[PDB]
Amino acid sequence: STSKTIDMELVKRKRIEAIRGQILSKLRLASPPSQGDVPPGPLPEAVLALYNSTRDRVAGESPEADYYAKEVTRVLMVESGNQIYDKFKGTPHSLYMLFNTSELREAVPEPVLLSRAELRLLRLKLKVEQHVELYQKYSQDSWRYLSNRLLAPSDSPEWLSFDVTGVVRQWLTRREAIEGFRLSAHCSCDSKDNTLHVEIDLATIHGMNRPFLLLMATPLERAALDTNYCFSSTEKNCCVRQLYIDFRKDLGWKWIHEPKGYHANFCLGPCPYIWSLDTQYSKVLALYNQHNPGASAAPCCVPQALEPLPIVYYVGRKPKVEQLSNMIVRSCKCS
Amino acid sequence: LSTSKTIDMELVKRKRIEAIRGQILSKLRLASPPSQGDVPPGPLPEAVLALYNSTRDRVAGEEADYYAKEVTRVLMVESGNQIYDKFKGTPHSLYMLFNTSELREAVPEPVLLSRAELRLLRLKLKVEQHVELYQKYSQDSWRYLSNRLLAPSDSPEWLSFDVTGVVRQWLTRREAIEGFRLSAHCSCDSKDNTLHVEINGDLATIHGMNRPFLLLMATPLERATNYCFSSTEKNCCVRQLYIDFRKDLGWKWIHEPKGYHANFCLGPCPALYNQHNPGASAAPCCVPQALEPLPIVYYVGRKPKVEQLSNMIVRSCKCS
Ligand SMILES: *[C@@H]1O[C@H](CO)[C@@H](O[C@@H]2O[C@H](CO)[C@@H](O[C@@H]3O[C@H](CO)[C@@H](O)[C@H](O)[C@@H]3O)[C@H](O)[C@H]2NC(C)=O)[C@H](O)[C@H]1NC(C)=O
């Protein structure tokens, strides 16, 4: 291990140097930004709090994201004391969260830059299981179902998240000043012999730590490859290549009755470092979505999206239908 | 010259073909192709083709191992008997119950089961509908599983519901009968002693062929960072590397954090092709699978910026 540990350190240094170009290329910077103007001392109150929640454990829901970094912003809902109580007065099992659309356009000027928008809630009900549903205020009159969530009991207050990216993108398109969501308890009912059975504050609503929208978008200053593009175009870079395999013609096998063949495509092509490649084009950028130059020390043209293959074959007199995983290559990536 | 590029591709294509020869055999865990002298000539039986079709059928629904899974299916109890007299005249509810012994014959032991799907032939062509799936936990109760918003489609469509955990629990249970419930979505809200309630021909095909069934994928009976940091492995795996922006990169511009666990993948990916060449590609590499982002805080002049960079932290590695 005397002459192997030192070899390991060279790999670690190779990884570190790739990360140097890795971070700078993501930020679309040739060199680290100038610091002469920066105030010394601790970070501001809003900056630390913004960075805090990005690391915090949140509740998940259950096109692919790009290589370059996303600017994260957040907008807290309109304050509790004003406006949000008179229109929905005394609703026992419904929580309303409305946002100023101009505050969203201040963070994200145009919708095309927005890549993800999350609605955040500070859940408090520790001991009992609850089933909730999320709704979007499309118009002033009706609400539309978005999603639901079965919430198991948790001993500690937990931050809940709802992916409302598609909804917030439509909000950035609209000029209407106020938009919002509605979180209500799950309704369970059933009709039977002309009878009908029906079964049905949770979170911080005021000040800081009230519900908010977390926006991840490409900043304005900075404003994989599936078979549907790899089969049409001839590319020098890493991509999917067609290969139909006949169990008779190519493998000399007769025991697979169904199918007689399938498209087992392969990945083939050079994977240069993303910063070593020409200025970014939409067709070349896709490959690099999971790009981590130092991870494997040498990036390879490997598959991303794969599909299974069901087959039919015999064991004696007995026919068997089986499914094989990861047989069909649908996309390739450099990583 | 394209004459000497055709030849290069043919060599790559043959390497892929030869790896696939080993891939298929290794997934089925066979050393050589099985003997076919006893196989009946002619078309496959009625049930065998139908079972195979549904594996290919295009369906809309909302890690798995390397080796192949045996696919079986079990149709629900027929309409005319037993399943209507206890649920007589339910206007907005469709009931699907299954014999638990038929499931244990298809999947002998619950540990072997890897996936179970409930299949429905949707019929409502023109109208958008919202449905919910329920499980018969007890003799008195049903339990919420999932829901589905169904957009209009001109053609009858096969719907799928992932009921793996439910069907696996059925094999754990000893009760002879189990089943599901598909009902219309209930939307209500109470306000000042008032209450608004909204709901939403047969919804799906219910009798004869193409009736609801469970599609079972299980390992045959005959085939019977938290891991990378503890053990030292020669093969491809995750390797520890903490990176301090000052100590390792010489940087002062990233105020938060001062560093992070950016692990790397390292190890050769040159009978047991599960960790050797899972993808069967011409040259397998040790590349990461699970990646995690890294939020940072830095300054550009006077304006502080908090940004998130994707795929910075390697959590798992694979041979591909
Ligand atoms: C499972 O999938 C295959 C996918 O093709 C299905 O194959 C089709 O089976 C039908 C069965 O009737 C064939 O229809 C035939 O039509 C000709 C006239 O065109 C008639 O002479 C035959 O008597 C038969 O009725 C159809 O051609 C065949 N598909 C292809 C591409 O040939 C199969 O039906 C599926 N499911 C089953 C068998 O339940």
Q: How is this structure best described in words?
A:
The structure is a homodimer. Chain A has 6 helices and 21 strands. With 335 residues, the first copy, chain A, is of the alpha+beta class. Chain A folds into 3 domains: 1-32, Helix non-globular (Single alpha-helices involved in coiled-coils or other helix-helix interfaces), CATH 6.10.250; 33-223, Jelly Rolls (Sandwich), CATH 2.60.120.970; 224-335, no CATH class. A 5-stranded mixed β-sheet of chain A has the order 1-7-4-11-2, covered by helices on one side. A 4-stranded antiparallel β-sheet of chain A has the order 3-8-5-6. Chain A has a 3-stranded antiparallel β-sheet with strand order 12-21-18. In chain A, a hairpin with a 2-residue loop joins strand 19 (306-315) and strand 20. The radius of gyration of chain A is 26 Å and the shape is globular. Chain A starts with a helix and ends with a strand. At the A-B interface, helix 1, helix 2, strand 2, strand 6 and strand 9 of A face helix 1, helix 2, strand 1, strand 5 and strand 8 of B. Strand 2 (70-76) of chain A pairs antiparallel with strand 18 of chain B, so a sheet runs across the interface. It is classed as protein binding. The entry lists the keywords pro-complex, latency, homodimer, protein binding. The assembly is dimeric. The entry is titled "Crystal Structure of pro-TGF-beta 1". Chains A, B are Transforming growth factor beta-1.
